[PDB]
Design a protein around this ligand. Structure first.
Ligand code: NA
Ligand code: NA
Ligand code: NA
Lengths: 268, 272, 269, 272, 270, 271, 271
């Protein structure tokens, strides 16, 4: 029986991941902004699920919650960083406040929480850190700059960490979903900047993209499968759409590198 | 007669930025180089007293970014090429990196450059020409032991750059992500570097990264390649510089591709 | 020759109103968070259109903008409070911050601008205050509580003011649009709270409503028609969808009042 | 507690309509928590009903104190069946005379306070699958006139919060009632605080009459019995008008809004 | 007879070797680090003789708390080793006041406060050792080393003055002046390098290389223990040939210059 | 040509003597003191070539303002002399953290900030002098003198590293190491002596006696400084007084002796 | 029945002498000092009748805590001795405001605060002594001694007013006016010297030398204080040492002569 701590557990992937752990017999602590958002999970598993109030934006609260969960449970086996939100807007339209906020949620908060729980994993010689990224963690396009920037920062913190904690048997999994249904599991908040005529043609489609094919329950099962495989992948894309964006981007980056390779190598 | 292109280079007092600034002035461009202390740039201004100016700028200071950007526009009328170069080397285990260290690196490498770019974008747009050159690293696409914070900042800068490029292409604005390896520090000097304490839990992994970051590129050749990239009809999104950068980038591309391929069945199976 | 000040002129309905004013021969000051969005308008009418930077969440900047306009233009004849955003969230899912932020854009901001520009209208004995509301200014439903609350506040500020300034010859018009096409004038900002499964059945359809038939240029022309009438209507609904929502809500309020009237009147001494 | 008894939480319970509601609840065998700024105001009711009535100090303006008081009641009583958001102030003055401070203060009392308190008690109502939220509005919740703009703006906001919430929470068996009284007799129950702005010459003719009106009186005891009838009816009305004045005002305004919509309908519909 | 060692900055490099030597010889060690977790490996290896305590030596109030707590639970500290610090390289002109103050905090003020906290109980016993980890740079400087040398020399002179005062109490004061040690077993300490501008690159470049990298830190830790086990403990213990050479060069040059100018020096009498 | 001297702590001791020697030699002097009135005599004697400016060297803000004002109005500073300071004697355990920090502010942080403020214009011109008033205590210590010596040594080492860095720009760095000087004609800085209990009296007592008092003439010290600055190779250090010379030699001898004593153990750590 | 003595500045000199004489007389002593180290031997030698408490009399909050702590644990204080302080020399013009304020904190405000905290329990009991260690300087001054004299004189007059008020309660107030005492046995108190200004050197120099062997025996001084307190009519003032007696009679002679000379003028100003 593993102890799971899942941030943003009241909606989307977080909720589906939290439900799948309790269903498998694990012990889950789900965090959300409002404890009561997880009232149904807790009332159905009074013994193995707990809801805690946590704003991933609040560093002080992160330290309190990490310490309280460690104190009362003795350990965290799996950390899942799922707290977050959707944001679409032109680079120029994104305010510094909106940019800093998204980084608090997707980067600084998850890093602080991860840092708080890493030592007991290292000391035990086992544990998993599961970071909910996006295909956006490797690529961007019109309207997605702030979002991709935050997810790519998360991804590179994960890559670095993974290399460091492999010796301790710690698994780091970067999950890269595409679009998933929201009727059954809900979703996190979403903000869409004013579209000004200069950007509408480019940014407009990204608004549609973010505003169907994916099953959150099947996603959570694939995450558990990847964690339970001998060699856990560093990244797990989820959805045909995510896969398509990722391969197309790998393709164009390699093409450009080869094209400019002689120039690149000539600066030696 | 033609108006000379106006280059604004941040962290232009040493290293790669000083090579880029030098390249611009020797080619006839007008250069505003920035540094925390203007006196850091005395040698540049002494050499090019008519075409080079030194302005005091801490890229961690958002109010000052806005003041400098507005001041440069007021006196030069425009900025043709913005080079976001300011920054530092940083090495430490993820567990060893303090929140303050992580935040300070994001200020320098992400928030400051984002603010400066937003301030200068509108005049590029209204003119219908301009270049934003963001100095990244092979670490803007990949990471390893001791490099987590650095790679995180550069990847954020790269993704801001990818999004922006897609949005401003219709305006004729060029966005260039530069991904160098290590350069010789002979004439131009070196940028600041911080190395976290290495404890025995991480030393075997983090140790080599410290060495990698400490020390053979030619910064002048690198600076020429940037200018070539900017002068070409199809300006690439990325320009890696140096053999090690290319090797690192190719190895990461391969590893990512191989992993995607292996896991593709599972990835595609999550639909209804 | 009238001086129009239009907030949120950057996109959607605000752009259309400002565009209609200049096409009519008036002088326009359009405000937005960023001036760069209004550049083509200023380019087309360089002597009669100006773009000013204004976040209506910032009380100090409202005061500065208002004073600057009155100094350089001498007056404001028509004030249009249009700045704002669409918002969707279950009541319980709305954080206090999401609630207060919407009240800044739709209520406190407009109230402050209006107070600052009211004295000069009152001294001149003419002026119009045009408050961009919604069918939501009179009614609400799942997912729409915060939005409706802000717009209803704005409508009732407008009702009380209208009665107060009528003797000064000042016009107050509450405009109640449905949804407009935004392929021409650009789409406004939109905020959506976290979605909870327990609420999805109800909030679902509202998200979809917000995320077509209205022509914003026709709406702008309707506003000016209403203003040009000697007895300006207090309210001007725009679009069949808005009229339908409003008549639906008026029907149900009326039926309820009738049903409970005996009990209601019975509570007096 | 008797098996059929209900827990009522009434804000602003020490005087006026809120006092009458609190008193009607105890008389009906219910258990009451009444709040006020000075708890000592409710001493005489607590002494008359030691085990079924409690006074708790609360400024609805104070959101931290809201959360504490709500948690306290739920801990100690186990539930709240009926919440009455009654705390409030009468306020009159010209739009132009009202300070931004006075406006924000009235929004805190009438809108943000109740919103937070409601939000805090809604989940125990949902889990139990029964409960009532009773919001004390005014005829002013649907209409305004000279001197009344701030007060109407706040009541209308509270009403629309209620309308939206009502639609969301009906599936859970939760009742949401908007009460719309006129002025009440004050001889037996007293009244709430009241502020009347300076009336300058330019507004005296319009605002004067509003001051008089706000200052045909309702019977608060019968008004409280009507709230209880409305809540006990299978189809609870969304709105309950109270008094001939409120009914006249509300029906007269619906009439005018409808007539105007009719007159302008061709113009309204023509915007496709 | 077991001794209680308190070693600041004990998790990596030289301090960790000093901690290792102590526990290997049967003494008790309290090692400090900004995070207790940095020391997990030492506590794992020596569960009964090593403890890790969180201490940021730039935090004076935390210094008082940690010293009192150690006394409360161990009853004494026999050997204090002021080891916490960092390497720092940069031109005098490029060094910010903040960077200068932070280095003084780590290398001077923190050590002074901690020493003060722990002296009374050594006086009371009539025994103890204060071991201050300096450098050849505690006696000399050169391009890029100004801030570093300044902090180490201050620590040295505090030490010289203290040694002369506490000798009658049976307290030993040892200034250790190491050169470059191998960092392959216990990791390396933190290091900050300033930007190196063209005006200073030729002079400061070689200093960056010198601190970036021939010495055995295990032998260095043994030499410290030997110097303390000796009836007459030297005031200074240079460690490494490189240290000896730097120190001799500076002695020679200071003496040559004193002599060259001596006639002028002596002619200022009233 | 005529040089511009900025002298901190100009109202007493070496600062006063150096300021008077500069103006007598035809140079221009800006002297600083906490109370400008302390420099009234200087300004009255040389109304056109001396100026008094108020400066507390513990106030970095004020340091910045004064440095900029002097550069703005004089156009340059040729010679910076750091003489601001005070004296303290007391057992290491008697010295409060506050007293310790205050000494470091006066002797180290203040002079460093002022030096950094004036270095670029020296570097740019290719000429200039930095004159730091240290002590034999900048190389050595003993009972009662720990705090003082620690601050002076910090200053010495900042000077060593700086001197090496700016030699290529022709800038002179001069560490002045005086012994005991008469104070009846030039005065001196404030002096504090901690409580001296019987347990420390035998060791600390002699140090109090030594700093309170005599042999040295500050006017002659000022001339020796100007002589060192005017010589082709300026020494990095200038001791002043036979007493300082004996202190410094004795310390060199014992440091060298102990190095040699333990040398085999030292070299034994090499792989 | 042994009395409870609270002695400030018990760490050296006179305060230590007084604390020791009290334990030797069989009394109970609480000695207070910024640092307690010097008192270790007294505490260990008399573990049941001597205690050392850390107290900086400049810190009013700490005065309050310590007064309260002693009253709660011992039940009372019979004899309060205000002895904390330092020596200080400087020309009036060379005395900075901070130097003047610091000396007033030590010699005036702290002692006033401690006395106030302990007076109620004396008043309620109907017995007690307040012993204030002044100086001949509490009545007179001369070059270099103005701050010291000003603080001691203020302490003396607080004492004169207090003595008159608390006489009817049976409380004794004793102003002790010592001259220079030997420091080789009991140790030496802190000493502060203002910046030296050459314009004052001839006047202030001799005073500096005055405070920098000494005739007085602190053990004999302690015995005389005890005798003064044991006497039914305790004198208001007790000079100690021939030097003190001579300074004081010199001052009384001059004040008396000047009063006489100007009496007619003085009395001529009546309405
Ligand atoms: Na480096
Ligand atoms: Na000073
Ligand atoms: Na003395």
């Amino acid at each position: 029986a593993k102890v799971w701590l899942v941030t943003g557990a009241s909606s989307g992937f977080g909720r589906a991941i939290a439900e799948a752990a309790v269903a498998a017999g694990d012990t889950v602590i789900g965090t959300a902004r409002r404890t009561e958002a997880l009232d149904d999970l807790v009332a159905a598993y009074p013994d193995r699920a707990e809801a805690i109030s946590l704003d991933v934006t609040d560093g002080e609260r992160i330290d309190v919650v990490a310490a309280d969960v460690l104190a009362r449970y003795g350990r965290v086996d799996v950390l899942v960083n799922n707290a977050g939100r959707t944001q679409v807007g032109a680079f120029e339209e994104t305010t510094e406040r909106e940019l800093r906020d998204l980084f608090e949620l997707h980067v600084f908060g998850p890093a602080r929480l991860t840092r708080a729980l890493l030592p007991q994993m290292r000391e035990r010689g086992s544990g998993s850190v599961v970071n909910i990224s996006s295909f956006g963690g490797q690529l961007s396009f019109a309207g997605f700059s702030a979002y991709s920037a935050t997810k790519a920062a998360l991804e590179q913190l994960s890559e670095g960490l993974a290399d460091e904690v492999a010796p301790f048997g710690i698994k780091v999994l970067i999950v890269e979903p595409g679009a998933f249904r929201t009727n059954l599991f809900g979703k996190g908040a979403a903000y869409f900047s004013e579209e000004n005529p200069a950007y509408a043609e480019k940014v407009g489609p990204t608004r549609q993209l973010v505003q169907q094919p994916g099953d959150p329950a099947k996603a959570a099962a694939a995450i558990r499968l990847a964690l339970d495989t001998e060699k856990t992948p560093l990244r797990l894309a989820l959805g045909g759409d995510a896969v398509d964006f990722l391969t197309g981007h790998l393709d164009s980056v390699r093409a450009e590198l080869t094209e400019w390779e002689k120039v690149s190598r000539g600066t030696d």
